[PDB]
C-alpha cells in the first residue's frame, strides 16, 4: 500500500483516511485514490485490499479498531485547506 500519504498528482478522485482507533499516537493514513479502484492498505502490517466503489470502500475489508474516513479527493483538498489554512491572508 501507500508508503507515504503525501501524493498530489491532482488527478485523484477519491480520498480515504485510515485512522487507527486503537492507536491514538499513530498518524492517520490519508490515501488518495480514483473512482472505483482497489485500495491496498496495511493495517497492523496486514494488507487489506479494499474495493472502492465511488469513493466508498468496503467496510467489510476493514479490521476492527480502525476508522475509515471516506471522501473525495476534492473534499480532502478543501478540508486540508480549511483546517490547516496553507494559504495566506
UniProtKB/TrEMBL annotation:
Task: Give the disulfide map.
Answer: 14-55
The protein's UniProt keywords, in alphabetical order, are: Signal
Name listed for the protein in its UniProt record: Uncharacterized protein
Species of origin reads: Pyricularia oryzae (strain P131)
Please spell out the taxonomic lineage of the organism that makes this protein: Eukaryota, Fungi, Dikarya, Ascomycota, Pezizomycotina
Q: Which residues of the full protein are shown?
A: 23 to 107 of 107
